[PDB]
Ligand binder design. Structure first.
Ligand code: NI
Length: 341
């Protein structure tokens, strides 16, 4: 049954609740972003209003074939009225089109639902600064102190330098980047840009990227693999068997693969600096695991919450075990006592 943490009290609204069939008494279904655990259940047969960002609206229309009369895209940073309730969509710093949602209840409660987000100090100068939030529905993906990772900027620097160096030493090396969903486009686009190549990918993937309102995308991507030395493949195929295979397919245009697997977190983060990352190598194939996160680290999350000072926190991630739940509630209490709210 629809869980309580996907329901907005005092409204007929749900958030990311498309896999439960008809949710009793739901008058508007909000979608934070186009990732499968969140959209699961949408299709061309959905006949209720869906509210979302313009980019997420493009992906519903073109990838899932949701009919246009049920898609209600909203501009960001703009006060809008949905079924008589004032709402604002804010940038979530997650994947393209990902939003957080501010609900202004008739009775005067203000509710922020983060969707998936990577908290950042820039959010402290959005519309959020202008009024108090009583309840926070928080993306708690990495809510434990062991989760540290570098800035996105430091990680992209690492990848750019690595790739530029390898291909300048060997102009017959191919770079491969793994993907299984939107997000993390900066990885493969930054590399292609430093090498003066377009990124080659399947037609299905090129279609997905054309939905995202990225400036000058026609200049950076292509479905012609031959003319490209940065290839995007499914994340599944980023392993020695999968890469040896792909290399055979290129017909001796290339003699070496350098591949990137942008993962969330890995236990090498507790020990290893970004400067200190090494690949796994077999033969003429090297694989780099890089910690490019589109979720908040524990410290980023803690700062955002201590800044916002909500009266109640509702976790949306890692809620399935008692030990998880109970550990998160302990951190919330530490944060609150340390900051004085
Ligand atoms: Ni997500």
């Amino acid at each position: 049954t629809c869980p309580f943490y996907k329901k907005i009290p005092g409204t007929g609204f749900t958030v990311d609740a498309f896999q439960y069939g008809v949710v009793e008494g739901c008058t508007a279904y909000f979608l934070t972003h186009f990732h499968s655990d969140h959209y699961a259940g949408l299709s061309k047969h959905f006949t209720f209003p869906v509210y979302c960002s313009e980019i997420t609206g493009n992906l519903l229309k073109n990838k899932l074939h949701v009919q246009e009369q049920y898609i209600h895209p909203l501009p960001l940073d703009t006060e809008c009225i949905v079924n008589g309730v004032k709402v604002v969509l804010l940038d979530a710093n997650h994947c393209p089109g990902a939003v957080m949602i501010l609900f202004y209840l008739p009775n005067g409660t203000v509710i922020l639902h983060t969707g998936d987000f990577r908290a950042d100090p820039s959010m402290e100068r959005s519309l959020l600064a202008d009024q108090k939030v009583h309840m926070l529905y928080l993306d708690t993906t990495y809510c434990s102190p062991e989760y540290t990772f570098p800035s996105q900027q430091e990680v992209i620097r690492f990848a750019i330098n690595t790739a530029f160096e390898a291909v300048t030493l060997n102009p017959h090396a191919l770079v491969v980047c793994g993907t299984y969903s939107i997000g993390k486009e900066k990885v493969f686009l930054a590399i292609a840009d430093v090498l003066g190549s377009k990124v080659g990918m399947s037609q299905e993937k090129y279609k997905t990227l054309q939905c995202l309102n990225i400036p000058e995308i026609n200049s950076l991507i292509t479905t012609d693999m031959c003319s490209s030395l940065v290839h995007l493949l499914p994340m599944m195929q980023i392993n020695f068997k999968g890469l040896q295979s792909h290399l055979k397919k290129c017909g001796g245009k290339y003699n070496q693969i350098l591949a990137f697997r942008p993962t969330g977190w890995t236990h090498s983060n507790k020990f290893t600096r970004i400067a200190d990352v090494i690949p796994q190598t077999k033969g003429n194939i090297s694989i780099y695991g890089i910690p490019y996160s589109e979720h908040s680290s524990y410290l980023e999350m803690k700062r955002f919450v201590q800044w916002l000072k909500p009266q109640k926190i509702i976790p949306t991630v890692n809620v399935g075990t008692w030990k998880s739940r109970s550990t998160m509630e302990k951190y919330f209490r530490e944060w609150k006592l340390e900051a004085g709210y």
